[PDB]
Amino acid sequence: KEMKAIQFDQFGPPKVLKLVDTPTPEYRKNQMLIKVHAASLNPIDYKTRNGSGFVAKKLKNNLPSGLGYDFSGEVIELGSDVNNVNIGDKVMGIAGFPDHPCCYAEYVCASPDTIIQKLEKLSFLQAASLPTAGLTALQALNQAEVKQGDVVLIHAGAGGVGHLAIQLAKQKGTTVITTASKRNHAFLKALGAEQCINYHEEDFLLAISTPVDAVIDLVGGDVGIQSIDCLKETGCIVSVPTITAGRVIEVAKQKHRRAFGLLKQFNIEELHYLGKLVSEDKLRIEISRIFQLSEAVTAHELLETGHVRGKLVFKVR
Numbered sequence: 001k002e003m004k005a006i007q008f009d010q011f012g013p014p015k016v017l018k019l020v021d022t023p024t025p026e027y028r029k030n031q032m033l034i035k036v037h038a039a040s041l042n043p044i045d046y047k048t049r050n051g052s053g054f055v056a057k058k059l060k061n062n063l064p065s066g067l068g069y070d071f072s073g074e075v076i077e078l079g080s081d082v083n084n085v086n087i088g089d090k091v092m093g094i095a096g097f098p099d100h101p102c103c104y105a106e107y108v109c110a111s112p113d114t115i116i117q118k119l120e121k122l123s124f125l126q127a128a129s130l131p132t133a134g135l136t137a138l139q140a141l142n143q144a145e146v147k148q149g150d151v152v153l154i155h156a157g158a159g160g161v162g163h164l165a166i167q168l169a170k171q172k173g174t175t176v177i178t179t180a181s182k183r184n185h186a187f188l189k190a191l192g193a194e195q196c197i198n199y200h201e202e203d204f205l206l207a208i209s210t211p212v213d214a215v216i217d218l219v220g221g222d223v224g225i226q227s228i229d230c231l232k233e234t235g236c237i238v239s240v241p242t243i244t245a246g247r248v249i250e251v252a253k254q255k256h257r258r259a260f261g262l263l264k265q266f267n268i269e270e271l272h273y274l275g276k277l278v279s280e281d282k283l284r285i286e287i288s289r290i291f292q293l294s295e296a297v298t299a300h301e302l303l304e305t306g307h308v309r310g311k312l313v314f315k316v317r
């Protein structure tokens with residue numbers, strides 16, 4: 001009943017992550033046990049681990065805790081009352097979201113409501129890299145009601161959510177403006193960005209010629225606040241980081257502009273859709289580095305720089 005898993009005993013720097021022997025998750029009669037093949041990293045992982053996030057509030061008196069929500073793998077055990085999944089099925093989805101992060105591990109417990117069948121053409125690494133980043137990109141674009149003709153500014157275009165959002169926005173027929181390092185300019189142009197603003201070189205507002213219909217703000221804080229000034233009268237900002245969502249919405253209200261937060265929800269139909277695109281080479285998931293669980297500290301140090309292009313992923317098997 002043992003497995004290897006990454007845990008942390010205290011909130012702190014990346015060094016607090018440990019590869020630990022731990023029991024296999026318990027599963028209820030309506031849940032399943034999954035042998036994990038792949039699990040991707042998201043910033044929420046390091047914000048929880050350093051204790052800054054809202055999820056850290058709930059785990060405060062409940063450590064040690066695992067980490068990770070995105071996973072890919074094989075169904076090994078099934079509860080008595082699970083009807084539509086079979087043992088041996090290859091699956092992809094989210095586990096333990098939000099209060100029981102657990103995917104940096106060899107086995108996870110999951111509900112059939114938070115997984116789908118992995119398409120055959122998808123690799124396990126691709127399948128584990130998609131759920132959080134992809135569902136967020138899509139639901140942000142939908143919250144902004146992006147249509148063909150619209151101008152869309154996507155901050156942090158080279159990252160996990162961004163690089164997908166750019167591709168999805170291009171496929172919607174929108175003019176895509178984005179912010180990134182000079183180093184990522186060529187990468188983002190190739191994915192469909194019309195303009196890549198080097199945000200180190202000048203105020204990004206100065207680089208934007210005309211009022212924008214939507215801002216997909218993936219940085220938040222003062223960048224999100226600043227983005228309000230480039231919106232059209234009818235434009236809206238979707239500020240995705242949760243910690244400054246309220247602040248950004250308030251300043252938008254004061255500027256008489258529409259603003260939204262975003263809380264990623266699991267959607268079977270959307271993830272089916274995103275996965276199909278990836279299998280048909282119509283949407284690229286950029287996996288910039290593949291780690292073993294043994295390298296979790298290193299992985300988290302890289303992720304916390306805030307300069308990861310695309311996705312980092314653990315190959316568990």
Ligand SMILES: NC(=O)C1=CN([C@@H]2O[C@H](COP(=O)(O)OP(=O)(O)OC[C@H]3O[C@@H](n4cnc5c(N)ncnc54)[C@H](OP(=O)(O)O)[C@@H]3O)[C@@H](O)[C@H]2O)C=CC1
Nearest residue numbers: 043136156158159160161179180181241262263264306307
């Ligand atoms: N509320 C929700 O349901 C969700 C919220 N999120 C949140 O959204 C945010 C982004 O997520 P994710 O895409 O995974 O993050 P990433 O770590 O993958 O994003 C890294 C990217 O950010 C860019 N970047 C860093 N600083 C700036 C800046 N000041 N201006 C413009 N770009 C910048 C970098 O570009 P470069 O190297 O070129 O400088 C890099 O490519 C996170 O804070 C995350 O917690 C994510 C998923 C769901």
